[PDB]
Ligand binder design. Structure first.
Ligand SMILES: Nc1nc2c(ncn2[C@@H]2O[C@H](COP(=O)(O)OP(=O)(O)NP(=O)(O)O)[C@@H](O)[C@H]2O)c(=O)[nH]1
Ligand SMILES: [Mg+2]
Lengths: 180, 177, 179
């Protein structure tokens, strides 16, 4: 006695699961941004301590200086990285937080409508099983609305993620190329 | 929900002590713990679960180049200054206000008076009078915020905790409004 | 009194300091680095999963997962090195240097006393005990032997650390091309 739009409901479950996983990648990206920022700074300090020690220690002038230059270079290349990651996080935050929420907002209206329609016919039956009488639009309209949104949403999800994954990957790689 | 709060403001003011006191309830004294570290906190703001991310910064010119890197995706800034340090307070408009805006001209800012204790103590009250200076009164700190657009102005001591908890409870409200 | 020693000791302290402040930035480096691997480990898993579960973006989640993974692998090695760095330097600070700084507190307990008891018992004179030098040897020969050690440990420590950082990026770019 339950209404089921099989294909559509399978897609709604998959979108909820995707948002769940994306929100998770999003949390990791944020942490990534914090830790990267903490690292970057140290390497800067470390770069000074070493450089200082380099001048106040001729016995180890070359050894400290060699490390000071490296910690300094890394710090600089790690600024470009931290930037790229902020862009990754920000971009995906919009997708989940806004684009996906727009659709889900429409998915909730449709489900609410599906359930009230089920309660409606059920009430009709347990009313017929009485003094006899044996002789939907909102649900159907909403059902069509989400079908369209799920389609646009999926198209946009692929473009955004394809670009964000490509660039994030490149940045991560570049933080070794120009660093080598 | 995830909110990102970054604490900036002239070095030596007490931004780090402000975050360690608030999150672990202990003065950063006793060794001065893990440098360039960041802090977070889970708080219940009116029957609501909030994940509060706190970003610490460095106040010396030398870190000017890699400071804005922590600014992106921020939800609320905390420009700090010491009520026992007039020189700092001035930099609130001189350096901080312009920078934070140079990057995020649309983010809610809140002014804070770090070190509300060493304002009525016998010593800095004399040496601060030995330099021909004086503490920072409510007005001008209250006016500094207004001279800016700060969504709020508060004062606290990481040593006494007094007014500490309110600082972050406000930052959250300034976010979800 | 004796200048040389107390100029050699004033420098074993400024040094014990800079190395203490290096030891700090080093513990931090460890911490922040450990965190970064956890996130990277988690991110590669999240990416691998999405890769299997998302055919539309299978390649993109695919290579991101691999990268994050080799990166985590290499990072553990780097972390090993950094841990060794900090530790070793820590030994040269909490022990080797303390052992030298302790025989100094002793030397000082029997240092100003000879210069004091001199200006002191100097007042009583004209009206009408020798191992201050034994400890002296244990603050000059205990000291100079420490500086050779500084050089020996730091020279090696400074180099492993640097090669490790270097290897880190070499191994990365290397393996980050076998694809
Ligand atoms: N009495 C008192 N002292 C404080 C307070 N906050 C910080 N201090 C002291 O002020 C000094 C500087 O504190 P700190 O937190 O390091 O300042 P900072 O703004 O983080 N400096 P930086 O940008 O360089 O890291 C420390 O010696 C600390 O004990 C406070 O509320 N009351
Ligand atoms: Mg600080």
């Amino acid at each position: 006695s339950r209404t089921v739009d099989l294909e559509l409901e399978l897609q709604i479950e998959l979108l909820r699961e995707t948002k769940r996983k994306y929100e998770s990648v999003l949390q990791l990206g944020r942490a990534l941004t914090a830790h990267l920022y903490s690292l970057l700074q140290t390497q800067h300090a470390l770069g000074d301590a070493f450089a200082d020690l380099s001048q106040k220690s001729p016995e180890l002038q070359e050894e400290f200086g060699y490390n000071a230059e490296t910690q300094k270079l890394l710090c600089k290349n790690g600024e470009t990285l931290l930037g790229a990651v902020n862009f990754f996080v920000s971009s995906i935050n919009t997708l989940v937080t806004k684009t996906m929420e727009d659709t889900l907002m429409t998915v909730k209206q449709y489900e609410a409508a599906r359930l009230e329609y089920d309660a409606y016919r059920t009430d009709l039956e347990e009313l017929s099983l009485g003094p006899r009488d044996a002789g939907r639009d909102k649900y159907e309209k909403l059902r069509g609305d989400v079908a369209i949104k799920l389609k646009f949403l999926e198209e946009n999800k692929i473009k955004v993620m394809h670009k964000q994954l490509l660039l994030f990957h490149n940045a991560v790689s570049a933080y070794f190329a120009g660093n080598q | 929900q995830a909110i990102k709060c970054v604490v900036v403001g002239d070095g030596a003011v007490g931004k780090t002590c402000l975050l360690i006191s608030y999150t672990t309830n202990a003065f950063p004294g006793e060794y001065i713990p893990t440098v360039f570290d960041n802090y977070s906190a889970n708080v219940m703001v009116d029957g609501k679960p909030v994940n509060l991310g706190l970003w610490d910064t460095a106040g010396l010119e030398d870190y000017d180049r890699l400071r804005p890197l922590s600014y992106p995706q921020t939800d609320v800034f905390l420009i700090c200054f010491s009520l026992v340090s007039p020189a700092s307070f001035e930099n609130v408009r001189a350096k901080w206000y312009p920078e934070v805006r140079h990057h995020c001209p649309n983010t809610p800012i809140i002014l804070v008076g770090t070190k509300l204790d060493l304002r009525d103590d016998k010593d800095t009250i004399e040496k601060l009078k030995e330099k021909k200076l004086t503490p920072i009164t409510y007005p001008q700190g209250l006016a500094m915020a207004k001279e800016i657009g700060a969504v709020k102005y508060l004062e606290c001591s990481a040593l006494t905790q007094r007014g500490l908890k309110t600082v972050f409870d406000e930052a959250i409200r300034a976010v979800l409004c």
